[PDB]
Structure 1
Amino acid sequence: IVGGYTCGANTVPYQVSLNSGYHFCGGSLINSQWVVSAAHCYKSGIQVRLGEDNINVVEGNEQFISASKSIVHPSYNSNTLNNDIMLIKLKSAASLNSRVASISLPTSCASAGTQCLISGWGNTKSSGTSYPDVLKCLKAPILSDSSCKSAYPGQITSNMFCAGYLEGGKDSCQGDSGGPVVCSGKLQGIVSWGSGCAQKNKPGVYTKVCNYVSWIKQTIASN
């Protein structure tokens, strides 16, 4: 996260870390057995880390759980990043408490201007690379579809939204992918892609979770 602040330990109880011997993506807990993340974070060997603040120190409150399976959206397109969503089933059910809790799915899409909380352990630099130990947070509005499309003409599908600041200085960055975008208590977005980090007129692009609620529900029911 570039331009954000320290969240505070366990204040984003639905944030997960995907680990393969290092932190490579984020994700959100949506029930005791399932995490949502981005299709592009897809790899074998994933250990889901819940209740993490400092990802380098065991502090207490962590639960380390192997993914049992990862489900990339069948229509995911790695050139376009259209349908950039993935579900991960935990080998066993997390223990839900105040530190480790699930985020609700929206029942309707958010409008332009809604303020959301984005969070991750990704690079905190616009230029160069500086990874934090602790979770960082950012408040960012959802931009209008007109602005989003005039920033990335021919690249925005109806399953993507833009959020952030046209002025540069504040954004998600390398490391943050798969992580939540939460707006009024629901998960509206997934960190997906952009152009550099916190560059002027190049806001971050997010997966539009409201378009996937049925798919999520349907796939979880059958697995």
Structure 2
Amino acid sequence: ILGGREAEAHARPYMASVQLNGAHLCGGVLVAEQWVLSAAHCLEDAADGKVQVLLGAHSLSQPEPSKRLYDVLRAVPHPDSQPDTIDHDLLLLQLSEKATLGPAVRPLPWQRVDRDVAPGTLCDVAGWGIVNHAGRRPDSLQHVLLPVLDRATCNRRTHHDGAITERLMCAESNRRDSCKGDSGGPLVCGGVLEGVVTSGSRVCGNRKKPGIYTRVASYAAWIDSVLA
């Protein structure tokens, strides 16, 4: 997160860190007791090793009683994920067991009505991604409030040139923005999960290249079937 602030201790209990051999790789959001939503491009770059999910954490390096690591039994793609759609694709991670819930670990309901978030709405993005362009990695969870950008403006030739489809949404990237290591993390509006960070190799903090989040309402039926 660029131009953000350190989040409050464990104020976002659905927040997950998808890890690769014990190192933060991408964000994730706990969506059921045994399921975490993340970005497919995340698991693709998952080096060669043990993928695990860290729940109940604030600080990545300090011991905390709510911190718990789970193994991923499997990762379930959706119907039209292919070579070329992977940048903005979702992935459902199934934990080795049901997560122990409490004040520092709790699923977040997601939006199930396919209707766009009104432009200008302030949504919260959290993550342990890059904090400056030089690559400073934070220890504690960061977050920022970003206004939703209307798709029309996001698709201008000067911005994303028609690449933003009905399954994606944009947020302003004027200084404040999500970046490298924030992908797979939540975009929450009004206490409801509306999108998932799916940055890819996008430049950060450039107002002309707004942040991209794939809309979870678009995949509600699919999430439903796999969780049931």
TM-score (norm 2): 0.91
Write the distance in 1 (CA, Å) between the matches of 2:70 and 2:99.
8
SS at match of 1:147: helix
Alignment correspondent of 2:206: 199
2:166 aligns with 158
2:222 maps to what in 1? 215
Q: How many residue pairs end up in the alignment?
A: 218
Task: Using the aligned pairs only, state the percent identity.
Answer: 36
Consecutive unaligned residues of structure 1, counting only runs of 5 or more, are: none
Q: CA RMSD in A?
A: 1.5
Give ranges in structure 2 of 5+ residues lacking alignment. Answer: none
| Of 141, 144, 149, the match for 1:138 | 144
Mapped to 2, the partners of 1:31 and 1:79 lie a distance apart of: 29
Q: Which runs of 4+ in 1 moved over 4 A?
A: none
State the alpha-carbon separation in 2 of the partners of residues 210 and 160 from structure 1. 10
Question: Do 2:172 and 2:207's aligned partners in 1 also have CA atoms closer than 8 Å?
Answer: no
Q: CA deviation at 1:83?
A: 5.3
- 1:25 paired with 2:26, answer yes
Q: CA offset at residue 81 of structure 1?
A: 3.9
Distance in 2 between residues matched to 1:78 and 1:173, nearest whole Å = 23
Tell me by how many angstroms 1:154 deviates. Answer: 2.9
Correspondences of 1:33-48 after superposition (within 5 Å): 33-42=34-43, 43=46, 45-48=50-53
Q: In the alignment, is the contact (CA less than 8 A) between 1:40 and 1:78 conserved in 2?
A: no
Q: Tell me how far apart the structure 1 counterparts of residues 135 and 68 of structure 2 sit (CA, whole Å).
A: 28
Moved more, 105-114 or 85-94: 105-114
In 1, Cα distance between the equivalents of 2:187 and 2:215?
A: 10
Q: 1:87 aligned to 2:95?
A: no
| Whole-angstrom distance in 2 between the partners of 1:119 and 1:101 | 15
Single out whichever of 147-156 and 203-212 deviates more from structure 2: 147-156
Deviations 1:61-109 (A, max 9, x none): 1011111111122422443446510001111111111110110011323
